[PDB]
Amino acid sequence: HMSKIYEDNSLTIGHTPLVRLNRIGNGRILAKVESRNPSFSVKCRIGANMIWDAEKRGVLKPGVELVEPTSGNTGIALAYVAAARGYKLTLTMPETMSIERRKLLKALGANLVLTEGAKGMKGAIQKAEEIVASDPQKYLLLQQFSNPANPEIHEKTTGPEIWEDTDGQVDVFISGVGTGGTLTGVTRYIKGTKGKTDLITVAVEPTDSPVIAQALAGEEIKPGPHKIQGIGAGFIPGNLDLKLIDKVVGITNEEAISTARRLMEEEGILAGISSGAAVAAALKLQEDESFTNKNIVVILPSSGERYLSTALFADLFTEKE
Amino acid sequence: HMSKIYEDNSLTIGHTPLVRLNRIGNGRILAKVESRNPSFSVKCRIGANMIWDAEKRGVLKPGVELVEPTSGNTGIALAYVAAARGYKLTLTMPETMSIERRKLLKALGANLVLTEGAKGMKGAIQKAEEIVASDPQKYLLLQQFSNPANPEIHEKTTGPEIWEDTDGQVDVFISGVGTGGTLTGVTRYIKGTKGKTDLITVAVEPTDSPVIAQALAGEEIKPGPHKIQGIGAGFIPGNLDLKLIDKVVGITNEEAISTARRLMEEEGILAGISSGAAVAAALKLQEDESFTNKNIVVILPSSGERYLSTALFADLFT
Numbered sequence: 001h002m003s004k005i006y007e008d009n010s011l012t013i014g015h016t017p018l019v020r021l022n023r024i025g026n027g028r029i030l031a032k033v034e035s036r037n038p039s040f041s042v043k044c045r046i047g048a049n050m051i052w053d054a055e056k057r058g059v060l061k062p063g064v065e066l067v068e069p070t071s072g073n074t075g076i077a078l079a080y081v082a083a084a085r086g087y088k089l090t091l092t093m094p095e096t097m098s099i100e101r102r103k104l105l106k107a108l109g110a111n112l113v114l115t116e117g118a119k120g121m122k123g124a125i126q127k128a129e130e131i132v133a134s135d136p137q138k139y140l141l142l143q144q145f146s147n148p149a150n151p152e153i154h155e156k157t158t159g160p161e162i163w164e165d166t167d168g169q170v171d172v173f174i175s176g177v178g179t180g181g182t183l184t185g186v187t188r189y190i191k192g193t194k195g196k197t198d199l200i201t202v203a204v205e206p207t208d209s210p211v212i213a214q215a216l217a218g219e220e221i222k223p224g225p226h227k228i229q230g231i232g233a234g235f236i237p238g239n240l241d242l243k244l245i246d247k248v249v250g251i252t253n254e255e256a257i258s259t260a261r262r263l264m265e266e267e268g269i270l271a272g273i274s275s276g277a278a279v280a281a282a283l284k285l286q287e288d289e290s291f292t293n294k295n296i297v298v299i300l301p302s303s304g305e306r307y308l309s310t311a312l313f314a315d316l317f318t319e320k321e
Numbered sequence: 322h323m324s325k326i327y328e329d330n331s332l333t334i335g336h337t338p339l340v341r342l343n344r345i346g347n348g349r350i351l352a353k354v355e356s357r358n359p360s361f362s363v364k365c366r367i368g369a370n371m372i373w374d375a376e377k378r379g380v381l382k383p384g385v386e387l388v389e390p391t392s393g394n395t396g397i398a399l400a401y402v403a404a405a406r407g408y409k410l411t412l413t414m415p416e417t418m419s420i421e422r423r424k425l426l427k428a429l430g431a432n433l434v435l436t437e438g439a440k441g442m443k444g445a446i447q448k449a450e451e452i453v454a455s456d457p458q459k460y461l462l463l464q465q466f467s468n469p470a471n472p473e474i475h476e477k478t479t480g481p482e483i484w485e486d487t488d489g490q491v492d493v494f495i496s497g498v499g500t501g502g503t504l505t506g507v508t509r510y511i512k513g514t515k516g517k518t519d520l521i522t523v524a525v526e527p528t529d530s531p532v533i534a535q536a537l538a539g540e541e542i543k544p545g546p547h548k549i550q551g552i553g554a555g556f557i558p559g560n561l562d563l564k565l566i567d568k569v570v571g572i573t574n575e576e577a578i579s580t581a582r583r584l585m586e587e588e589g590i591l592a593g594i595s596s597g598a599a600v601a602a603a604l605k606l607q608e609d610e611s612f613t614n615k616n617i618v619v620i621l622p623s624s625g626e627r628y629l630s631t632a633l634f635a636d637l638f639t
């Protein structure tokens with residue numbers, strides 16, 4: 001894309017590189033590095049577009065302050081966009097969110113409201129609702145799991161970049177599902193706008209919280225705890241369009257961690273746990289002869305630098321090592 | 322640039338965004354965000370090009386391994402490129418190096434050799450030389466402070482990006498100097514290749530180690546300790562072409578840290594200490610009427626996320 005001066009850092013989102021994996025898999029895995037973003041994750045796109053959309057809809061205007069419950073990369077994305085565009089932001093999250101993330105969020109100007117650790121994200125969602133209810137004219141909740149501006153940005157940026165960078169040669173699209181925006185939006189551009197209805201869209205989820213598989217089977221939703229940060233919220237988000245999914249691959253915590261470590265050591269791509277999960281799903285599909293000659297695009301949501309205090313960098317090296 | 326599939330992560334360097342600063346300075350500071358790079362710093366460009374250059378020179382034949390003494394972003398850059406392109410890499414550094422940083426380099430496949438803490442960077446340089454001397458056919462030292470492939474990549478990528486993104490309108494170019502490659506290579510492109518000899522090139526350094534100022538004034542070189550990671554090595558590097566510098570601005574530790582905090586809180590640009598230093602220098606220039614109407618391009622070398630254990634994030638809470 002074209003040379004310019006960006007008017008603020010929110011406008012720099014996307015155009016992330018698509019990199020061939022040469023040592024992991026058969027040479028047809030193409031990794032889309034979504035840590036090449038202004039706050040270093042796929043969420044940069046949705047922090048930008050949910051705020052731009054709120055501006056366009058007339059609900060974010062001078063005097064209105066943003067609120068969102070998030071203990072993750074969405075909080076970081078909303079923080080840098082609010083700072084870049086001159087909005088006040090309040091984030092709610094359980095008091096168990098890491099010091100690294102609190103430091104980042106405060107440095108970017110966010111106002112943090114810490115909720116009881118025992119109540120997890122449910123307690124943070126309740127606190128965000130309470131804050132907005134205290135002054136609904138003042139506060140705007142963005143609602144990342146249902147706000148259509150989330151999948152919209154992937155329809156307008158992420159998907160077009162995959163189509164253009166592969167010159168239409170993509171055959172398989174793999175996305176670990178958190179909010180579902182990435183899966184939904186990219187698939188709507190490729191299957192819908194470009195008419196490629198035989199794209200294979202693969203949802204990735206934790207083996208220990210396989211709610212997408214349960215929903216497609218018409219079974220009871222029964223989530224569980226797991227370590228693949230950023231995916232597997234334990235329900236079907238509003239922003240996940242189940243009708244667009246062709247296959248669901250469940251990944252273990254250990255598979256996700258080990259494959260993220262391989263991205264770093266074998267490909268030089270700093271990668272988070274969910275990036276390992278998505279590439280591990282590509283490797284499982286390449287066990288099946290139907291996939292042997294397909295070009296597989298995989299989203300890598302985050303950089304392993306954000307994971308130094310997590311399982312990803314634990315049980316890896318001995319004191320002596 | 323042209324839509325494509327990159328054949329490895331080293332080929333994804335550059336095309337970093339130039340962002341107008343709206344609250345910091347007069348609206349004419351244009352910040353080039355060099356953390357938008359495959360290992361998140363300006364050094365990703367030189368990790369790639371020093372290795373590409375070694376390949377082109379025929380000195381990276383099968384069995385040859387890389388060695389470099391580095392405590393910083395160059396070690397992370399060389400590690401991701403060596404992992405991407407299938408080389409073995411040894412980095413030397415003092416044992417002071419944090420366990421978390423050893424884990425990150427380790428995860429990228431680097432072999433670490435930890436040297437005696439009291440001997441600092443000098444001890445790490447000594448150990449790298451000793452490793453190469455133990456088997457010179459096997460080991461290749463990249464020598465980031467003198468290897469011309471460092472400023473070359475900035476002449477071939479960073480410089481052109483600044484020229485294109487500003488439509489040639491860049492009046493002032495500000496770089497905090499570590500190796501000098503950024504300053505040297507960008508200035509060679511803009512003053513030389515593009516012929517814009519009216520460009521004002523500004524070197525930034527710590528007030529507590531003002532060796533560039535000393536060199537340009539013809540004063541004795543007298544370095545000192547400071548906090549501005551990535552700049553101010555306390556000598557004039559081979560890759561710093563002093564002839565290209567118009568002005569040197571010295572920045573305090575506190576000015577660097579406070580201005581980096583403003584980049585984060587006021588602009589939403591995650592920024593390291595040296596990014597704060599370089600922008601602090603732009604602010605000083607904008608106090609001088611001669612600079613008021615000028616477009617000022619400033620390099621932001623790194624992201625504040627790499628500084629979470631440092632004073633950059635101190636006193637954010639009670």
Ligand SMILES: Cc1ccc(C[C@@]2(C(=O)O)C[C@H]2c2ccccc2)cc1
Pocket residue numbers: 043069070071072073074075177178179229230231232233234
């Ligand atoms: C540590 C961490 C990282 C990323 C996330 C992603 C999400 C966010 O708010 O940033 C979207 C939400 C999420 C929460 C739980 C499971 C999956 C996604 C959450 C927590």
Ligand SMILES: Cc1ccc(C[C@@]2(C(=O)O)C[C@H]2c2ccccc2)cc1
Pocket residue numbers: 364390391392393394395396465498499500550551552553554555
């Ligand atoms: C902590 C840290 C960060 C960046 C650097 C930059 C350099 C590196 O090897 O990565 C170039 C070298 C350097 C060393 C001392 C002063 C300035 C630059 C060094 C140390």
Ligand SMILES: *Cc1c(COP(=O)(O)O)cnc(C)c1O
Pocket residue numbers: 041042043072073074176177178179180181182183229230231272274275301302
């Ligand atoms: C958000 C996120 C995902 C999932 O992306 P969605 O578009 O929300 O499905 C995966 N990994 C990480 C690290 C994320 O932050």
Ligand SMILES: *Cc1c(COP(=O)(O)O)cnc(C)c1O
Pocket residue numbers: 362363364393394395497498499500501502503504550551552593595596622623
């Ligand atoms: C390398 C580096 C610089 C200085 O860039 P040079 O091109 O080496 O002069 C500044 N800040 C940081 C953090 C760096 O890593």
Ligand SMILES: [Co+2]
Pocket residue numbers: 001002322323336
């Ligand atoms: Co481009």
